[PDB]
Every structure is written in structure tokens, then in C-alpha cells.
Enzyme design. Structure first.
Site, short mmCIF file in Angstrom:
data_model
loop_
_atom_site.label_atom_id
_atom_site.label_comp_id
_atom_site.label_asym_id
_atom_site.label_seq_id
_atom_site.Cartn_x
_atom_site.Cartn_y
_atom_site.Cartn_z
N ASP A 248 0.92 -1.19 0.42
CA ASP A 248 0.15 -0.04 0.15
C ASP A 248 1.12 1.18 0.10
OD1 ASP A 248 -1.79 2.33 1.08
OD2 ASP A 248 -3.98 0.54 1.00
N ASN B 30 -13.58 -3.04 2.82
CA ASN B 30 -14.40 -1.50 2.99
C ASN B 30 -14.45 -1.73 2.29
OD1 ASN B 30 -12.55 -0.56 5.42
ND2 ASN B 30 -11.21 -0.19 4.46
N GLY C 140 -15.49 3.03 4.39
CA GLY C 140 -14.59 3.66 4.46
C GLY C 140 -13.01 3.64 3.08
N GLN C 141 -14.56 2.58 1.51
CA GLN C 141 -14.00 2.39 0.45
C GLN C 141 -13.60 3.78 -0.22
OE1 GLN C 141 -16.20 -0.34 -1.54
NE2 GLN C 141 -15.35 -0.62 -3.16
N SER C 142 -12.64 3.54 -1.07
CA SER C 142 -12.02 4.87 -1.73
C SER C 142 -12.02 4.46 -3.57
CB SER C 142 -10.80 5.25 -1.11
OG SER C 142 -10.14 4.79 -1.48
N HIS D 218 -10.61 -4.64 -2.29
CA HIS D 218 -9.23 -4.69 -2.32
C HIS D 218 -8.99 -5.11 -0.84
CE1 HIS D 218 -10.41 -1.08 -2.09
NE2 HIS D 218 -9.66 -0.42 -0.79
N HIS E 174 -7.24 -5.59 2.29
CA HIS E 174 -5.67 -5.25 3.68
C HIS E 174 -5.49 -6.27 3.66
CE1 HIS E 174 -6.90 -0.39 2.82
NE2 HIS E 174 -8.37 -1.04 2.21
N1 LIG Z 1 -1.13 4.22 -6.62
C1 LIG Z 1 -1.23 2.65 -5.75
N2 LIG Z 1 -0.24 2.09 -5.12
C2 LIG Z 1 -0.92 1.72 -3.85
N3 LIG Z 1 -1.61 1.30 -2.57
C3 LIG Z 1 -2.44 2.49 -3.11
C4 LIG Z 1 -2.00 3.35 -4.39
N4 LIG Z 1 -3.71 3.92 -4.73
C5 LIG Z 1 -4.08 3.81 -3.91
N5 LIG Z 1 -4.18 3.26 -3.15
C6 LIG Z 1 -4.00 2.49 -1.79
O1 LIG Z 1 -5.65 2.06 -2.09
C7 LIG Z 1 -6.36 1.99 -0.36
C8 LIG Z 1 -7.43 2.03 -1.49
O2 LIG Z 1 -7.98 1.65 0.27
C9 LIG Z 1 -5.41 3.10 -0.12
O3 LIG Z 1 -5.46 1.62 1.36
C10 LIG Z 1 -4.64 3.26 -0.88
O4 LIG Z 1 -3.06 3.75 0.38
#
Ligand SMILES: Nc1ncnc2c1ncn2[C@@H]1O[C@H](CO)[C@@H](O)[C@H]1O
Ligand SMILES: Nc1ncnc2c1ncn2[C@@H]1O[C@H](CO)[C@@H](O)[C@H]1O
Ligand code: NA
Ligand code: NA
Ligand code: NA
Ligand code: NA
Lengths: 115, 115
Positions: free
Chosen positions: B32, B88, B94-96, B101, B103
Site C-alpha cells: 500500500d 471496506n 471507508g472505501q475510496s 481490495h 488490506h
Molecule cells: N497507486 C497505488 N499503489 C498502492 N496503493 C495505493 C495506490 N493508490 C491508492 N492506494 C491504496 O489503496 C487503498 C484503497 O483502499 C488505500 O489504502 C491507498 O493508500
């Protein structure tokens, strides 16, 4: 014994009750006794697997089933805004009970880091 | 497109690099970029599934594969004392990034609640 020798074995054998929200031939879901969110439940396999690090390749479909059960329960419980799924391994993960269990938490904003 | 239309699609297509620690025909694992623990990596399916709540029953074995990959990587990275796995969903989870994915966090005591 079917279900293993932990708290969760007793729950699977029904020797002690739990607030059961889902049951099938593979898995059980029930509310957590120490909730950390307005909705907080567990999904467990009926097969004793002690921890995720002890799961085998042939357990993938069962592990994924935990996740699909969790999705269904979350919908049944109205978690329209989302939720967090958590599995703890070992001491650094905060695992207390050595039977695999998936936490599902929602009904509030979940924060970051996740502990 | 294979891999979908998110950051993680770009990573799967290799259009942008990531620090890859595992690859097979089903999944990818990489560190990450914003680590929340001394070890913090992601496991993603190569199949675009947007969120866990969009996974289908036939995805169980792939979802479980994410977990088995995570176990393997954790061992490769020396997480002898354990770890926490997190998925998430949606805004409260908290999913962005709308590609599933997992963690995997370790190398420190993980706390409770998990956010
Ligand atoms: N380019 C990337 N490479 C690795 N992790 C990433 C990247 N972009 C976003 N993330 C991670 O993806 C996750 C989305 O939950 C976050 O913890 C964030 O830090
Ligand atoms: N008898 C029980 N019924 C429901 N949840 C329980 C029980 N015993 C322990 N737990 C929960 O199991 C989890 C183990 O990770 C904890 O979150 C804890 O609160
Ligand atoms: Na068993
Ligand atoms: Na909150
Ligand atoms: Na795809
Ligand atoms: Na800590």
C-alpha cells in the site's frame, strides 16, 4: 467434535445460544456480544479452522462464503451506507478465539487506520 | 477493459507500476502507498468486482483466494506474530477505490475497535 473446542464450537453445537441471523450447512452468523458499532456481527465456518493462517487452498470457497454471507446479512440489517469486514490473526491481529471468524461492522462511519 | 476503470485497473494492466509481491492468474498483491502499519499490503482480484456488496455467489472461490494469497504474502514478509485483514464497503466502510481490495496489516499490535 464437529465445530471444535472454543467458544464458537459451543455456539455451533447450540450448547449455548447466540443471536443467530443466518445459518446454512457451511456457516453461521450471529451478533457480537461486545459490539464496536451499531451493527456488529460475526460470520463463522461450521468447520473448525483455527485461524486464517491454518486455512488450506481447498478452503477458499468456504472463506469466500463467509464474505458472501456477510454481504447478505449486512443487507438484511439495512447497512445501505456500507460496512467493514475484518479477520484477525494471531496476537498482533488481536485474535482471542482460535476459530476463524469474520467481523462485519457498520451503522457508523468506520475510521482509519483500522486499529 | 480487463481490470476495470479505477487506479487498480491501471495497476493490473501494468500501465503504472506497483511494488508487486505476488501475481497469479486470479489476483495481484502489492504494498500500500499509504501504509498504516510496518507491513501493509493489498490483495486484489484481476476480475473487476467493484465492491464486496457487488460480488456474486460464483465469486466465493476468488474471494477466498484473496485471503489465501494474503496468508502467503504475510508469511513471506515474516508476519509471525499475526496480522489483520480488512475489506471496506462503501462510504461507511471507508472505501475510496471501487475495485475490491483486501488490506493485510501487521508488524505491530493492531488495536480495537478496528476503526
Ligand atoms: N497507486 C497505488 N499503489 C498502492 N496503493 C495505493 C495506490 N493508490 C491508492 N492506494 C491504496 O489503496 C487503498 C484503497 O483502499 C488505500 O489504502 C491507498 O493508500
Ligand atoms: N458468546 C459469544 N457470542 C457472541 N460473540 C462473542 C461471544 N464470545 C465472544 N464473542 C465475540 O467474539 C469475538 C472474537 O473476536 C469478539 O468480538 C467477542 O466479543
Ligand atoms: Na470441524
Ligand atoms: Na464514527
Ligand atoms: Na474484469
Ligand atoms: Na500498535
Amino acid at each position: 467434535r464437529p465445530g471444535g473446542d472454543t467458544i464458537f464450537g459451543k455456539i455451533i453445537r447450540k450448547e449455548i445460544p447466540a443471536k443467530i441471523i443466518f445459518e446454512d450447512d457451511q456457516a453461521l452468523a450471529f451478533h457480537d456480544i461486545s459490539p464496536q458499532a451499531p451493527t456488529h456481527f460475526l460470520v463463522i465456518p461450521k468447520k473448525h479452522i483455527s485461524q486464517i493462517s491454518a486455512a488450506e487452498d481447498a478452503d477458499e470457497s468456504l472463506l469466500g462464503h463467509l464474505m458472501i454471507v456477510g454481504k447478505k446479512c449486512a443487507a438484511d440489517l439495512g447497512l445501505k451506507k456500507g460496512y467493514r469486514m475484518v479477520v484477525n490473526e494471531g496476537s498482533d491481529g488481536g485474535q482471542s478465539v482460535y476459530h476463524v471468524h469474520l467481523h462485519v461492522l457498520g451503522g457508523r462511519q468506520m475510521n482509519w487506520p483500522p486499529g
